[PDB]
């Protein structure tokens, strides 16, 4: 096999040029398809052209930043020095302008919108004040992250809610997800037959969770998920001044669950501080995963609001975490170590899909069993309370009634009107004691009732509430924060960092409370920008 | 935060009084609700008053025993010394009176009831004699536990079967369980839709198992389960004279499965003797769990008889275990170590519920798969036997026919009449080779046939049997003793005590046989007290 | 208990004779039943007589070989020496006769059958040549296994396809399996109700997998599976000259999956060579398991062809493995060590059934989830391609179209006609990127369409293809070779042999390719013997 040896030697000699040429040919073929499509018809091929353009722009941008990082940093340095020199007096001017802007916005927009929006702003202040009073180290508070996190939420809300471009963008983004979740019906129909709709939740909704988990694993293998995570984490790190580890985890928890987001930084967990560990747990409790997003949309919950809430939950989580548990130690991990995220042990795309599918088995099983147990307990509790309430000739006592009268102040501070605050309080109670699947199920019921158009009151009982209240409830309920999740979060994090078991347990409860506050903070910002129809 | 530090110092200074006062206020509030309910109406609030009274009585009782244990023991000592002094002659009088009482009961009650009850008593003697002949150490038999265990069963049967108070109490207790298992329909309806009744067993019965497992975990967290276990174990220990470890496990196996009852004593397993290890396995094989109780009731099996059999199975298990495998060593574990039972790692009630729910996944999955395999094998075996039986012009040969002609003597000794003994033998065969889900399914069929009222014989084949025979079959089938369970029992116990693998394997088969004998012993006692309608 | 001690002493003294006599009595009873059945009627009892006769023959044969092995080997030795002496010249005569026979068969049978059969023979040559060119060590090729493996396939095909006895035998064997898979309906009906047919695949097909897995475990406990494996492995070892380890694994992969066949040789995995490890993986990828056989038959795929393909896949796997990755080291494991296969830790038959049932849980769960994900991805890909294809006014672009135009040459070489080659290529694509459940589902659709008798072309689109093409597709698709299975195969084999992780990864890709080639080789042989109707 002398010829074979010569071929092997030739391949070894010019390995780099051979593969580079092959990739170049593939790129040229793709560009040829794009240009030909535009030539035949442009209006029909516009989205393909747009996707190609943005991809080219980002690839060129990333290459330039990597290659010319030193030159750009040196070029920026003189301006930074000048700003540092004049900052001692310029800080008052900047702060005064920002305060004036906030005042003007309240006077000319919030007051015009109505009283409820002002109450939302007041609740935002009150929640922040309460977090300060009950802080771990009230004296040792670094206020830069708190203000920046709130400001970033306010800017995101303005761009996505009060501007036609952002409103259109997220409405389009939500509609694509709604289209994407319909593909799972093909697999559900075969496995469970054409009668799979006889059992809606089990045979139609859970397959959506399976399909999304598969896609998320495929994206992780390709590396797009990390690409977005790094881009977002840099913004939060630069503006807020947080540690790289917590910034990366917060950015990654937008798309990933509480139990799989810390895996983005596994080696460095033993060396993190208590504050960073608290922030990690807080971020997990203040967000949802991309696998369960489709199920909530299938119920009837707005896709745009869910996406907006998930994005806004990261800066709030870090801001509340820093205020609730500030940093009193020296961080050890650096930016390069945090940003590098180890992809899984998948040789090819299809193997990644199988791994994602297999992981979804325990996910759906636990979801189904937990729902069965919780609803069974709820029915038992309601029957028992009715039995106890009949002694005083009040047989209507129920878990809902107690929660409505208990969690009412929390909803009123978020800007919900007096009548609907009692209805939102029930959803808050469902989320706090059970999981958020129950709360969104009840919320979907109310949304459907309103869309039907039936009477708003029957026998003196309110049947549905306003559209604005539904939006606020959507933001407040977007989280994995429940008393039950405390144990599994602790167990998983100890399994990843056995040496830090003592520290993990200490901050878990504070993190669980911080996550709920962060969700409420997002709801307050949504409430003060939405209008009363 | 000087004020915060002062508040923290104040809380630390009087931590004990602060929490005690809070608990006192809660207790006062509960009492205020109870008294107010009684004032408004007494007949309507009676059960709440009763529950409060018994709870107060037990709390006071437990506190007094804990505080005044030494004084009470010293007060009792003189009487014990006097009894010991006169016991050498007083033992004959007591034994003679007990023998005379047994004779009188047989003559004036059993003979009046009929021949079958006398046969039940004879079978009770015969089973005990057979256990003695095939004992491990026939010479080294301690007869106190054997007689006390049988006597306790006889007293329990008299109080629960032949007295209006006990009969009413357990009928009421069974009805509450029947009400309790209906709450799972709320969760089943949502997960599996309103058509969940199209698939009865999978979508309605298994959720009952999930719900009960959840409740059992919640009770274990609160500590009620241990409270009852200690109370029962003390009675068996004091009367029978068994070791604390086996007494606790036997009392706990009334409510818990064979594989989770030994966890009540995990640390001390390596130090137990062979006899105690045999008793532990025997108790597991002679009882059922509280999670599968609802499924059996859903089939149609009597709730009262199931509860009565579960209670009566513990003294029988210990009695047969001691006789079959008596003690020839010195026990090491003491009472205080055995009674202390380590609760699970659950921070709150809701976390306990989630843990109980998660554990039920493997339970229902194994149940469903095992049933599919066993019934498929049963159909294959019956077809093969019919194929083989046709050679001799007898195509009716089947697994049922062989079992009916094989296990008939065991049922006749339990007091079943000649005609129905062949029908009970089939159920015994189903339980021995398959699990007890199959046997109870067949028993429910027969119960439904009788309740319908159709012909008792069609084409010369008996369709159903008497009510008394159904009760006896209910007692005999209440156990986890099957050839398949031998492996999983050994594996789980080795996993808990790796060093004792050699001892565990040796006694597993004897324990499996002892459990079946104990179940038969309970059935014999039930048969000799029930009447022929 | 002096009598008991005497009985124990008597049992110990003559333990061997006591159990031997008991077994003899049981054998005599069985023979009495057989003879009596024949006496009453012979034609009705014929199959029982046949089974008894063959069992007796094999038992006697095995005993004689074990006892008289040395004498037989010595008796054969002189002939072997004489053949070795004259082999230097006799080899040319034997080889020439074999070549002449092949030529005569082609001229007088293949040419008569038609052109397509000749193309199948050409494809067989071409696939072998390609494996030679891309071999790991082309110079160090041992050609004995390659020719013997192909020859054994040719002989098996002749006996099973072109002879009435073999054709009848495998048709009968397939029909028995079809009867055997109907027994699972008994368990499915109870667990999932009488409406279990509303969801065909989940509630009827998967239980078949559960039932077969249970039966396979029971057979493994009894030892029949090993008995057949040794008999087949000896034939392949003697004729082909392969190592005992790979021969045993190849014979065992006919009945067992890729992940459980290596367990037949667990201790010796660290000591195998690279070539043997490659052969093990190749055999796993070139065969299916007996648990999934029923599901494929339920779809509508021929049982006889599936059995024939599974048998023919072992010699092909070894032949291709040796050619693709020949041996350049010295094997260490011997025949006695390889043949001894350690049965599982099952005390009795029923425990084995439970263990087999439990293992099937993960099997069916992974199957269902993988199918849901793959079909969902397929729908998404097709929609995306249609969206991209509309730019060029070609909205019919799809995964099927691309695969049809890509994998066409592979199907044409196997002997499929021009029109049907494009249809077979789609099935090949489904098997390569997804699993073989999808491909067989599509194949069953085509088979049903043909059996209906509808038009073969509608709107110029072929709806179904010939019966011969369906057979060829059946042979080509019989394998577990897919890109996704690569990871799980590597993980399982590393878990069994941790030290060989580096070697396992290197040969996995070559093994995956070899398995597909082996499946194609079987299809080519089937194509050249089947006739065009
Ligand atoms: C419209 C809805 C949302 C708009 C959000 C807009 C958010 C921007 C709002 C306001 C931007 C201006 C805020 C500047 C505050 C100074 C922070 C600082 O660094 O010094 C700290 C004083 O920190 C304090 O104690 C100040 C707390 C009260 C300030 C209220 C204003 C002390 O130094 P540091 O601890 O090292 O830090
Ligand atoms: C129009 C609608 C209504 C108004 C909405 C306004 C929304 C404003 C949203 C976000 C602005 C948030 C400002 C928070 C300032 C934190 C103060 C601090 O100590 O950090 C300082 C950062 O230096 C700065 O002051 C940052 C200035 C950013 C200007 C934003 C435009 C210095 O950091 P440090 O020395 O490390 O300490
Ligand atoms: C009505 C239905 C159920 C009623 C149950 C009523 C049960 C109560 C029945 C009977 C109560 C009286 C039993 C007393 C028997 C003596 C036991 C004893 O301690 O000495 C043992 C003799 O042990 C023996 O060998 C006696 C065995 C035969 C006795 C039959 C009576 C020897 O000493 P030990 O080994 O150290 O003990
Ligand atoms: C009315 C219906 C029909 C009659 C039903 C009767 C039901 C009777 C049910 C239970 C009574 C069971 C009696 C078993 C006696 C065991 C003998 C023994 O050696 O242990 C002795 C216990 O000392 C005793 O004898 C216990 C006396 C208990 C009296 C019960 C009233 C001494 O123990 P040891 O020295 O450690 O040895
Ligand atoms: C009908 C459909 C299927 C029929 C299958 C029939 C199969 C039987 C077909 C043919 C049987 C005769 C084959 C004998 C070939 C010699 C093999 C040998 O041992 O020497 C080798 C030469 O090896 C070679 O290079 C020969 C390759 C070309 C031979 C084509 C004929 C070298 O020695 P080795 O490496 O130590 O070995
Ligand atoms: C009728 C239909 C058409 C014809 C179909 C024919 C189907 C033929 C099918 C199978 C025959 C395959 C023959 C392959 C021979 C391999 C050559 C080799 O080196 O090994 C030699 C084996 O010694 C042999 O030659 C084996 C002879 C077997 C004769 C079969 C009858 C010596 O081994 P080595 O010294 O260790 O090297
Ligand atoms: C959660 C993860 C992803 C959810 C994000 C949405 C991804 C799916 C959108 C694409 C879609 O459904 O339309 C398809 C185009 O699909 C593509 O062109 C995507 C190319 C890659 C065609 O559907 P159409 O637009 O109805 O025509
Ligand atoms: N991808 C994940 O990690 C995930 N998804 C769902 N849940 C759990 O399911 C519950 C309800 O959806 C949540 O509270 C979580 O505890 N976890
Ligand atoms: N809670 C438990 O431990 C449990 N419950 C059921 N089973 C098993 O399920 C089988 C039939 O119910 C029993 O024989 C047991 O082996 N075990
Ligand atoms: N018994 C087994 O080992 C088995 N059975 C099925 N599969 C997997 O299921 C997939 C489709 O059946 C195959 O590719 C295998 O990867 N494995
Ligand atoms: Na999240
Ligand atoms: Na949130
Ligand atoms: Na039990
Ligand atoms: Na029992
Ligand atoms: Na196989
Ligand atoms: Na194959």
Residue B458 pairs in a beta bridge with B461
**Residues belonging to chain C:** 533
- How far, in whole angstroms, is CA C51 from its chain's centroid? 24
Nearest to C193 among B138, B199, B373 (CB): B199
Residue at token pair 């989830």: C369
Spatial separation of the C-alpha atoms in residues C492 and C259, rounded to whole Å:
6
Q: Which residues of C215-236 are buried (b: 16+ CB within 10 A; e: fewer)?
A: bbbbbbbeeebbeebbebbbeb
Spatial separation of the C-alpha atoms in residues A214 and A123, rounded to whole Å:
40
Pairing of strands B457-458, A461-462: unpaired
Which 3 state secondary structure label does DSSP give A328? coil
* A177 and chain C in contact, CB less than 8 A: no
Q: Which residues of C453-480 are buried (b: 16+ CB within 10 A; e: fewer)?
A: eeeeeeeeeebbbbebbbbbbbbbbbbb
Residue A120: name the closest of A148, A95, A154, A152 by CA: A154
Q: Where are the alpha helices (DSSP H) in C334-478?
A: 335-339, 349-389, 399-406, 408-413, 418-433, 436-452, 467-476
DSSP readout, A181-249? Answer: TTTHHHHHHHHH-TTGGGSHIIIIIHHHHHHHHHHHHHHHHHTHHHHHHHHHHHHHHHHH---HHHHHH
Contacts of A415 by beta carbon, 8 Å cutoff, 6+ apart: A116, A117, A119, A120, A123, A472, A523, A524, A527, A528
Cβ atoms < 10 Å from Cβ of A118: 15
Residue A358: name the closest of C213, C203, C363 by CA: C363
Instruction: Kindly list the residues from chain A whose CB atom is less than 8 angstroms away from the CB atom of residue C388.
Output: 48
**Residues belonging to chain B:** 533
Where does residue C272 fall: left (phi above 0), alpha (psi -120 to 50 degrees), or beta otherwise? beta
Instruction: Please say whether the beta carbons of B236 and B250 come within 8 A.
Output: yes
Q: List phi, psi (to 5°) of C410.
A: -65, -35
Q: What H or E segment, with its residue span, contains residue A457? A: strand A457-458
Cβ atoms < 10 Å from Cβ of C21: 11
Spatial separation of the C-alpha atoms in residues A273 and A280, rounded to whole Å:
11
Tell me the C-alpha to C-alpha distance, in Å, between residue A47 and each of A41, A43, A500, C391: 12, 9, 49, 11
Please calculate the CA angle C412-C415-C417 and round it to the nearest 5 degrees. 70
Give helix B349-389 / helix A349-389 axis angle, nearest 10°.
Answer: 110
Contacts of A22 by beta carbon, 8 Å cutoff, 6+ apart: none
Residue at token pair 């396992």: C504
Spatial separation of the C-alpha atoms in residues C285 and C518, rounded to whole Å:
9
Contacts of A506 by beta carbon, 8 Å cutoff, 6+ apart: A274
Residue B295: name the closest of B189, B389, B204 by CA: B204
Q: Where are the alpha helices (DSSP H) in C456-500?
A: 467-476, 485-496
Contacts of A229 by beta carbon, 8 Å cutoff, 6+ apart: A248, A251, A252, A255, A264, A341
**Ligand 2 site-directed mutation target among A108, A117, A148, A327, most atoms within 8 Å of CB:** A148
Instruction: Please say whether the beta carbons of A443 and A387 come within 8 A.
Output: no
* Local structure of residue A270 (DSSP, 8 states): G
**Residues belonging to chain A:** 533
- How far, in whole angstroms, is CA A258 from its chain's centroid? 11
Spatial separation of the C-alpha atoms in residues C214 and B366, rounded to whole Å:
13
Spatial separation of the C-alpha atoms in residues B163 and B183, rounded to whole Å:
32
Spatial separation of the C-alpha atoms in residues A232 and A147, rounded to whole Å:
18
Spatial separation of the C-alpha atoms in residues C307 and C302, rounded to whole Å:
9
Please calculate the CA angle A122-A125-A128 and round it to the nearest 5 degrees. 150
DSSP readout, A485-503? Answer: HHHHHHHHHHHH-GGGHHH
- Structure tokens of C229? 């494996």
- Structure tokens of C264? 């037949």
Rg (CA), chain A: 26
Ligand number with the minimum distance to the CA of C382: 7
Contacts of A463 by beta carbon, 8 Å cutoff, 6+ apart: A446, A449, A454, A455, A456, A457
Q: Convert B359-372 into a string of H (helix), E (strand) and C (coil).
A: HHHHHHHHHHHHHH
Instruction: Please say whether the beta carbons of C218 and B374 come within 8 A.
Output: no
Which of B31, B43, B50, B211 to substitute to test the interface with A, most A CBs within 10 Å?
A: B211
Beta carbons of A138 and B48 less than 8 Å apart: no
Spatial separation of the C-alpha atoms in residues B495 and C437, rounded to whole Å:
38
- Structure tokens of A309? 């809430």
- Structure tokens of A8? 């092997």
Rg (CA), chain C: 26
Spatial separation of the C-alpha atoms in residues B74 and C390, rounded to whole Å:
98
Torsion angle of alpha carbons B30, B34, B40, B42, nearest 10°? 170
Burial group, residue B202, by CB count within 10 angstroms (0-12, 13-18, 19+):
buried
Instruction: Please say whether the beta carbons of A217 and A352 come within 8 A.
Output: yes
How many Å lie between the centroid of ligand 16 and the Cα of residue C412?
A: 18
Q: What H or E segment, with its residue span, contains residue A462? A: strand A461-462
Which of C137, C375, C483 to substitute to test the interface with A, most A CBs within 10 Å?
A: C375
Residues 346-365 in C contacting B (C-alpha not used; CB under 8 Å):
346-348, 350-351, 353-358, 360-361
Spatial separation of the C-alpha atoms in residues C226 and C254, rounded to whole Å:
12
Q: What H or E segment, with its residue span, contains residue C462? A: strand C461-462
Q: What residues does the ion ligand 13 have nearby, CB within 5 Å?
A: B 253, 287
Name the residue of chain B whose CA is nearest to C344's CA: B487
- Structure tokens of A249? 């985890």
Q: What H or E segment, with its residue span, contains residue C2? A: helix C2-13
Residue C134: name the closest of B193, A1, A500 by CA: A1
DSSP readout, C253-274? Answer: TTTS-TTTSGGGG-TTGGG--H
**Ligand 1 site-directed mutation target among A95, A140, A147, A148, most atoms within 8 Å of CB:** A147
Q: Which residues of B259-272 are buried (b: 16+ CB within 10 A; e: fewer)?
A: bbbbbbbeebbeeb
* Local structure of residue C204 (DSSP, 8 states): I
How many Å lie between the centroid of ligand 16 and the Cα of residue C285?
A: 8
DSSP readout, C215-254? Answer: HHHHHHHHTHHHHHHHHHHHHHHHHH---HHHHHHHHHTT
Instruction: Please say whether the beta carbons of B355 and B192 come within 8 A.
Output: no
Beta carbons of B348 and A486 less than 8 Å apart: yes
Contacts of B215 by beta carbon, 8 Å cutoff, 6+ apart: B356
Contacts of A449 by beta carbon, 8 Å cutoff, 6+ apart: A463, A464
Instruction: Please say whether the beta carbons of B512 and B278 come within 8 A.
Output: no
Spatial separation of the C-alpha atoms in residues B100 and B92, rounded to whole Å:
12
Spatial separation of the C-alpha atoms in residues A367 and A372, rounded to whole Å:
9
Pairing of strands A457-458, A461-462: antiparallel
Contacts of A26 by beta carbon, 8 Å cutoff, 6+ apart: none
Q: Convert C291-342 into a string of H (helix), E (strand) and C (coil).
A: CCHHHHHHHCCCHHHHHHHHHHHHHHHHHHHHHHCCCCCCCCCCHHHHHCCC
Experimental method, per PDB record: cryo-EM
Spatial separation of the C-alpha atoms in residues B371 and C186, rounded to whole Å:
10
Ligand 1, atom 5: closest residue by C-alpha: A151
Burial group, residue C6, by CB count within 10 angstroms (0-12, 13-18, 19+):
exposed
Beta carbons of C138 and A41 less than 8 Å apart: no
- Structure tokens of B80? 């014990």
Spatial separation of the C-alpha atoms in residues B491 and B509, rounded to whole Å:
14
Q: What number of helices (H) and strands (E) belong to chain B?
A: 25, 2
Spatial separation of the C-alpha atoms in residues B237 and B336, rounded to whole Å:
13
**Ligand 3 site-directed mutation target among B143, B316, B319, B529, most atoms within 8 Å of CB:** B143
Chain breaks in chain C (C to N over 2.5 A) after: none
Instruction: Please say whether the beta carbons of A496 and A267 come within 8 A.
Output: no
- Structure tokens of C105? 């068969």
Give helix C274-285 / helix C501-529 axis angle, nearest 10°.
Answer: 50
Which 3 state secondary structure label does DSSP give A287? coil
Q: Where are the alpha helices (DSSP H) in B223-348?
A: 224-240, 244-252, 274-285, 293-299, 303-324, 335-339
Spatial separation of the C-alpha atoms in residues A123 and B108, rounded to whole Å:
82
Instruction: Please say whether the beta carbons of B167 and B174 come within 8 A.
Output: no
Residue A293: name the closest of A285, A303, A284, A283 by CA: A303
Q: First vs last Cα of chain C: how many Å apart?
A: 82
Instruction: Please say whether the beta carbons of C4 and B134 come within 8 A.
Output: no
How many Å lie between the centroid of ligand 14 and the Cα of residue B250?
A: 11
DSSP readout, A300-323? Answer: T--HHHHHHHHHHHHHHHHHHHHH
Spatial separation of the C-alpha atoms in residues B156 and B307, rounded to whole Å:
12
Which 3 state secondary structure label does DSSP give A29? helix
Spatial separation of the C-alpha atoms in residues C514 and B201, rounded to whole Å:
46
Tell me the C-alpha to C-alpha distance, in Å, between residue C234 and each of C247, C289, C317: 8, 21, 16
- Structure tokens of B424? 């009970």
Instruction: Please say whether the beta carbons of B426 and B403 come within 8 A.
Output: yes
Instruction: Please say whether the beta carbons of C427 and C443 come within 8 A.
Output: yes
Residue A156: name the closest of A310, A332, A262, A329 by CA: A310
Nearest to B391 among C40, C196, C357 (CB): C40
Spatial separation of the C-alpha atoms in residues C203 and B81, rounded to whole Å:
70
Rg (CA), chain B: 26
Q: List phi, psi (to 5°) of B457.
A: -135, 130
- Structure tokens of A327? 């940093």
DSSP readout, B296-308? Answer: HHHHT--HHHHHH
Q: Convert B48-71 into a string of H (helix), E (strand) and C (coil).
A: HHHHHHHHHHHHHHHHHHHHCHHH
Spatial separation of the C-alpha atoms in residues A253 and A244, rounded to whole Å:
14
Spatial separation of the C-alpha atoms in residues C403 and C457, rounded to whole Å:
20
Spatial separation of the C-alpha atoms in residues C153 and C161, rounded to whole Å:
12
Which of B31, B40, B42, B187 to substitute to test the interface with A, most A CBs within 10 Å?
A: B187
Where does residue C241 fall: left (phi above 0), alpha (psi -120 to 50 degrees), or beta otherwise? left
Beta carbons of A351 and C138 less than 8 Å apart: no
How many Å lie between the centroid of ligand 1 and the Cα of residue A145?
A: 10
Cβ atoms < 10 Å from Cβ of B45: 22
- Our answer on whether the CB atom of C281 is closer than 6 Å to any ligand 10 atom is no
- Structure tokens of A389? 């309430």
Residue at token pair 């009482």: B101
Beta carbons of C391 and A180 less than 8 Å apart: no
Instruction: Please say whether the beta carbons of B472 and B523 come within 8 A.
Output: yes
Spatial separation of the C-alpha atoms in residues A147 and C232, rounded to whole Å:
77
A neighbours by CB contacts (3+ pairs under 8 Å):
B, C
């Amino acid at each position: 096999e002398r010829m074979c040896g010569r071929m092997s030697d030739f391949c070894r000699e010019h390995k780099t040029t051979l593969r580079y040429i092959i990739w170049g040919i593939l790129i040229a073929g793709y560009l040829a398809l794009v240009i030909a499509a535009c030539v035949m018809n442009f209006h029909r091929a516009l989205p393909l052209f747009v996707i190609t353009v943005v991809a080219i722009f980002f690839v060129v941008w990333d290459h330039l930043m990597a290659k010319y990082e030193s030159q750009i940093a040196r070029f920026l340095s003189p301006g930074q020095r000048l700003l540092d020199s004049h900052w001692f007096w310029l800080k008052w001017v900047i702060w005064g302008c920002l305060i004036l802007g906030v005042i003007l916005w309240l006077v000319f927009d919030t007051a015009k919108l109505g009283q409820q929006q002002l109450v939302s702003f007041g609740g935002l202040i009150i929640y922040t004040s309460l977090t300060f009073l009950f802080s771990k180290h009230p004296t040792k508070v670094y206020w830069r992250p708190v203000f920046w996190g709130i400001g970033l939420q306010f800017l995101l809300g303005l761009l996505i809610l009060r501007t036609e471009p952002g409103f259109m963008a997220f409405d389009w983004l939500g509609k694509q997800v709604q289209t994407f979740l319909g593909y799972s019906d093909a697999g559900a129909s075969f496995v469970f037959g054409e009668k799979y709709t006889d059992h809606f939740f089990a045979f139609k909704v859970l397959p959506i969770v399976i399909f999304f988990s598969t896609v998320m694993s495929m994206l992780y293998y390709l590396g797009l998920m990390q690409w977005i995570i790094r881009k977002v984490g840099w913004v939060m790190l630069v503006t807020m001044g947080t540690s790289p580890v917590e910034s990366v985890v917060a950015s990654g928890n937008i798309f990933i669950g509480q139990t799989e987001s810390p895996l983005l930084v596994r080696p460095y967990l033993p060396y993190v501080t208590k504050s960073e560990l608290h922030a990690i747990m807080t971020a997990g409790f203040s967000t949802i995963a991309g696998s369960v997003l489709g199920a909530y949309i299938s119920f009837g919950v707005s896709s745009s609001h869910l996406l907006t809430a998930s994005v806004m939950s990261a800066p709030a989580a870090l801001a509340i975490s820093k205020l609730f548990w500030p940093e009193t130690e020296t961080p050890k991990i650096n930016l390069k170590n945090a940003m590098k995220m180890e992809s899984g042990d998948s040789r090819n795309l299809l193997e990644a899909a199988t791994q994602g599918a297999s992981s979804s088995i325990s996910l759906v099983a636990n979801i189904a069993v937990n729902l069965i147990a919780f609803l069974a307990l709820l029915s038992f509790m309601n029957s028992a309370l009715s039995w106890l309430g009949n002694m005083f000739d009040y047989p209507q006592l129920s878990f809902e009634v107690i929660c409505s009268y208990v969690f009412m102040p929390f909803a009123f501070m978020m800007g919900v009107d007096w009548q609907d605050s009692f209805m939102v309080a029930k959803l808050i109670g469902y989320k706090t004691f059970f999981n958020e699947f129950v709360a969104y199920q009840q919320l979907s019921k109310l949304i459907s009732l309103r869309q039907v158009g039936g009477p708003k009151f029957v026998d003196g009982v309110q049947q549905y509430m306003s559209m604005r209240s539904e939006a606020i409830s959507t933001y407040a309920l977007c989280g994995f924060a429940n008393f039950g999740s405390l144990g599994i979060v602790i167990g998983g994090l100890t399994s990843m960092a056995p040496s830090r078991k003592r520290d993990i347990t200490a901050g878990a409860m504070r993190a669980l409370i911080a996550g709920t506050i962060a969700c409420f903070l997002t709801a307050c910002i949504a409430g003060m920008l939405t209008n009363t129809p």
